[PDB]
Symmetry: D2
Subunit: 302 residues, 4 copies
C-alpha cells in the first residue's frame, strides 16, 4: 500500500500530499543510483513485452506547467528502445478534435498489445481545464445535454473507458506530478533566464497561475472520482526533480513486473519444423556454422 498510490474512490485529500515529501529515499545520491537500476530493468521488461504481443501499457502524466512532465519522461523513459513506443502530447484540441467526442483523440492513441504509449496530459484534460474554465458551456453540443451533469458523467465515462481498456489488455499508469506554486515560479524564472529554455515559455503559462486554486480542487475531485485497484492514481511530490524521477522509475518498474512479460515459447510442432530448417542450413554449409551443439559438428566431413 504505497503512501503515494490511490486505489479507491472518495479517499483522497490533496492537503495531506505535500509537494516536497521525500520519505521513500532521503539521500539524493542513493536515489540517482536506484534510478539507474530501475531504468535497466525497464528496458529489459520492454523487450519481453514487445516480443510477447499480449498486453499494452499507457504511462500518463498529468500536471501543471513546469511540474516536470517532459523532463521526467525524458530522463526515465529514454531508456526505452524506439520499437513499440509512441509519445503523445494532448495540446489544445484542433477544430476536428472538438467536432468529435473528447475521448476520440485519446482512444485513437491507445497502444497495440506489446507496446507502450506515453501520454503528456491525457483525457483528464476534460475534467481539469474543462471543469475549471467550464469549456463545455461554449462548445457545440445537443440541446438535450444537461450542463449541470456534464462533469459527473465524464467521471463515469472515464471510469468506464479505463476499465474497458483494462479488460482488453491495456493498463494505464496515471501519474500526478504534484508541484507547489512557488516551485513552478522558480522553474518559470529558469525558462525565462536561460536562452536554451526560452522556447518553452509562453504567455498563457503565466496567466494560468491565476486559476491555481481551482486547478488544485479539480485535481482533488478527479482523483477521488477515478481511482480504482485496476486503474490507480499516483500522486508524486514534484518539488525535487531527482526524487520525482526516482519515484516514477519505481512505479513503471513495479507495473511492468505485475504484467510479467516473457519471451514466447513456440509450440511443439513449430519446434520440429525449426529443427528441420536447422539441419538444412547446416547441410548447406557442411556444418560450418556456430551451433551451440558441438557434438554434431564433429560428425560431419571437412
Amino acid at each position: 500500500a504505497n503512501i503515494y498510490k490511490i486505489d479507491k474512490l472518495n479517499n483522497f485529500n490533496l492537503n495531506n500530499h505535500k509537494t516536497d515529501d521525500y520519505s521513500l529515499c532521503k539521500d539524493k545520491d542513493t536515489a540517482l543510483e536506484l534510478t539507474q537500476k530501475n531504468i535497466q530493468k525497464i528496458y529489459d521488461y520492454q523487450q519481453k513485452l514487445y516480443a510477447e504481443k499480449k498486453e499494452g501499457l499507457i504511462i500518463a502524466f498529468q500536471a501543471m506547467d513546469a511540474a516536470g512532465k517532459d523532463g521526467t519522461i525524458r530522463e526515465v523513459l529514454k531508456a526505452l528502445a524506439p520499437q513499440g513506443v509512441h509519445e503523445k502530447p494532448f495540446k489544445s484540441p484542433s477544430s476536428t478534435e472538438l467536432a468529435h467526442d473528447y475521448l476520440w483523440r485519446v482512444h485513437n492513441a491507445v497502444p497495440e498489445k506489446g507496446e507502450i504509449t506515453i501520454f503528456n496530459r491525457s483525457h483528464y484534460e476534460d475534467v481539469l481545464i474543462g471543469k475549471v474554465k467550464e469549456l463545455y458551456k461554449f462548445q457545440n453540443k445537443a440541446d438535450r445535454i444537461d450542463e449541470n451533469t456534464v462533469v459527473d458523467n465524464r467521471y463515469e465515462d472515464i471510469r468506464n473507458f479505463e476499465k474497458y481498456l483494462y479488460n482488453n489488455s491495456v493498463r494505464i499508469i496515471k501519474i500526478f506530478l504534484n508541484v507547489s506554486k512557488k516551485e513552478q515560479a522558480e522553474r518559470f524564472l529558469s525558462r525565462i533566464e536561460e536562452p536554451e529554455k526560452n522556447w518553452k515559455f509562453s504567455d498563457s503559462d503565466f496567466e494560468e497561475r491565476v486559476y491555481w486554486d481551482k486547478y488544485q480542487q479539480a485535481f482533488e475531485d478527479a482523483i477521488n472520482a477515478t481511482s480504482t485497484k485496476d486503474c490507480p492514481w499516483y500522486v508524486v511530490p514534484a518539488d525535487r526533480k531527482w526524487y520525482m524521477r526516482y519515484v516514477v522509475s519505481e512505479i513503471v518498474v513495479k507495473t511492468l513486473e505485475e504484467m510479467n512479460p516473457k519471451y514466447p515459447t513456440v509450440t511443439k510442432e513449430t519446434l520440429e519444423r525449426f529443427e528441420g530448417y536447422r539441419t538444412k542450413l547446416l547441410e548447406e554449409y557442411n556444418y560450418d556454422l556456430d551451433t551451440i551443439r558441438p557434438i554434431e559438428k564433429l560428425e560431419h566431413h571437412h
Copy 2:
C-alpha cells in the same frame, strides 16, 4: 413499436417473425410512404449538417443477404454526400486485432453534424466472436478470464454507447431479421445473375452451418444492450419493400427527436451583416437583387 426494444432482458426472438408486415400490408402504399420519408431525411440532414451539434450512427447488423447493402443504398442514397461516411466492418486486419476491439469502431464515429453508416458494427465481437469463440485464439494478457470475456463485452458496449449518447452522438441499431430460406433464395440469385456473382463467396455458404448459434447470439446481444437511449430495432427482412419502408420510418423518427434547425445568428452578427449588405449594394449602385427594402443615407 412492436419492433423497438428499449429495455434489458425483454426480447424473445421466436416472437419476431421474419415475414411480419403489420405496419403496412399494401406494397404500393409502402413504396409511396418510403418516398416521403426519404425527402424528410434529406431535409433533416441539411439542418443537422448546418447546426454542427449532434452526430448520428446508423448501424445495420445481420446475416449475409439479409438486405444491409440494398437497404442502405435504396433508403440513404437520398443523402447529400456532405457529412456522410459509410464504413463496412469486415474481418479485422492485423493492426485492428493488435488494438482493442472498439478502437476501429470509435475511430469511425461521426463528427457533430455528420452521419456515419455502419455495415456491421462493434456487435461483431459478440456475434461471430461468441459463436466461433475467437477470443480463445487471439493474443491477450494471461490475467484475462476467458469465461467472462463475453459478459464484459456486453458491459463495455453498453457503457461505450451511453458515453456516445452523453457526447452528442446517437446510434440507431437495426437488426434485419431474415429467414434462412429467404437467404438461400437471395444467394441463389447471387449465383444465377452474372452481375451479382461478385457478391457471393465460399464463406457465405459455409456460415449457414452456424445459423442457429448466430440466432442465439443475436438474442443475447439484444437482451444485453437495448436501452431507452440506445434501442434495438428488429426489422422483418423477408420482403425488401417492407424492410426499406420500416428503416425509413426509424431514421426519420430519430432525426425528428434530434430536431435539427438551421442556426440563427446573434444580434451583433446580424448588424455586421447589414454593414456588409450596404457595402455590396453601394459597390454596384443598388443593382443587386434583394428581397428586403433598401434604406439610404
Copy 3:
C-alpha cells in the same frame, strides 16, 4: 466538356473564359432534363466501379466562395449511393496539418480502388491562398528552403503527385468553377438575407474580396502549370447554377465512361463451385426456390 477542358501546359488564358458562357446548352429546361439523365448514368457507373475494385476517382472542386461548390456537389452527386463515397472539405490547416507537409492531408484522403472521394477545395489551396498571401514566409521550414522557389516547386510536386496517382489507378477530375465578382456578391447578399443561409456567411468571406484580382492571377498560373492529358483542368462557367450543374454532370459521366467499369466475371473454377452450392441449396429446399431455370424443377419431389 471541350472548349472548357485544358489538357496542355502553358495554354490557358482566363480572359477568354467567360463566367456566363452557356454555349453547350442555351435552354435551361433542356439542361435540367439532360442533367437528370447524366445523374442516372453516374449512379450506374458507380455501382460497377464499386463492384470491380480496380480504379478510384477523385472529383475535386476549386473556386472562390459562393462560386457554387457545395450546391453543385449536393445537386449532382447526391445521386451516388453512400457506399464507397467520402466528401472532404479542405479548410484552413490545423496545427498538426501545418506541422506535416502540405500534401500529407490530401494524400491521406485519396480513395481506395472502387471508390469516389469528393474534394471541396484541394491541394491547390497551397498555390492559391498560399501564393496570394505568401503564407510560406511565416510558416516553419528549414533554413535551406529558398523562399522564391517555393511556389515553382509546388507546381512540379503537384504535377508529380497527380501523375503518381494516375499510374496507380486513381484519376482526378479538377473543376474550376469560374464565377464573376458581381455574381459572388449577389450570392453573398442571399446568404445574408435568407434565414436558412445565414450560417454560411462569414466575415472573412467578405474581406477576401479585396484580393480578388490576385486570386484570379493565381488560378491562371495554376492551370497553366498543372493541366495534362491525364490530369486535365475543366473551367466551368459558374454564373448560372443550372448550367454549371449540367456541365459538371457531363464531365463526371464522360470520365466514368473512359474508366469503363464492369461487374467482374468470376473464374471458370469459381463458377463450378458456385453450381455445387446451387444444387445444395436447391436440394435443401427440394427445388422450391425461384431458380431462373425452371425446367430442372420438373424432375424433383
Copy 4:
C-alpha cells in the same frame, strides 16, 4: 565516401562487400566512437524538437537478419521518446492494398522537429514487389501497362523523396548489406536460443530461394533512386559492431548538416518576459533562485 551513393546509375553491388571494415578496423575503437556519436545524436535531437523546422526519416531496408532491429535498438535507443516513432512496414493489409502503395508511407512521415524510423519502407514495392511481380495479381485499372509498372515506381519514388526534401523532410536510406551465410548463422541463432524463437518464421527460411533476385532488385533500386539530396548508404552488415558504428556516423553527419538550434526569441517577447519575471519576483518577496 565508399559507402554513399549520391548519383543515378553509379552502383555495382559486387564491389560492395558484406564484410568491409575499412573505416575502423579496431572493434574497441569503433565502440568508443559509437558512444560519442550517440551522445551527439541525443543533443541534436533535443534541438531539432525545439526548433520545429525539419523532420527526419531514418529508413532501413535489407534482408531478414541483416541487422535492422538490433541496429535501430543499439544506436537510436539514446533518443528521448519525444517526437520519435518507429514504423515497421510489414505485408500490406487489405486496406493498404486497396490504396496506392505510397499511401501508408506518406501517412507516417514525421512532423517538423520529429524523427520517424522506418523498418523497411516504400522500397518494398520494387524489391519483393519486383522479384515476385506482385503487381500482376493485384487489382489495378485495365489501362495500367504491366511492363512499365516498375520503371514508373522508380520515377514516382524519386519524385516523392524530392517532394519531401523540398518540404523540410530528409530521408536517410540505409541498406544493410549482409551475406547469405551470415544470415544463416543469425537464423541458426534464432532457432537455438529459446529467447529468440519468436523472431523466426517459416517464410524467413523460404525467401532464401530468391536470394539472387533480391540482390539484383537492390542493385536496380540503388541505381534508380540515389541523388545528392536523397542518397543511399550501403553499409556492410556482417559485423554488428562495425554496422552500428557506421550507422551512428551517418545519423550524426546528417543531423549536423540540418544544424538544429534552440530558437531565439524576438526582441518583443524578451520584454514581455521581463515583465513576467518582475511579477513573479514581486509575488514572492524577491525570494527566488536567479542569476
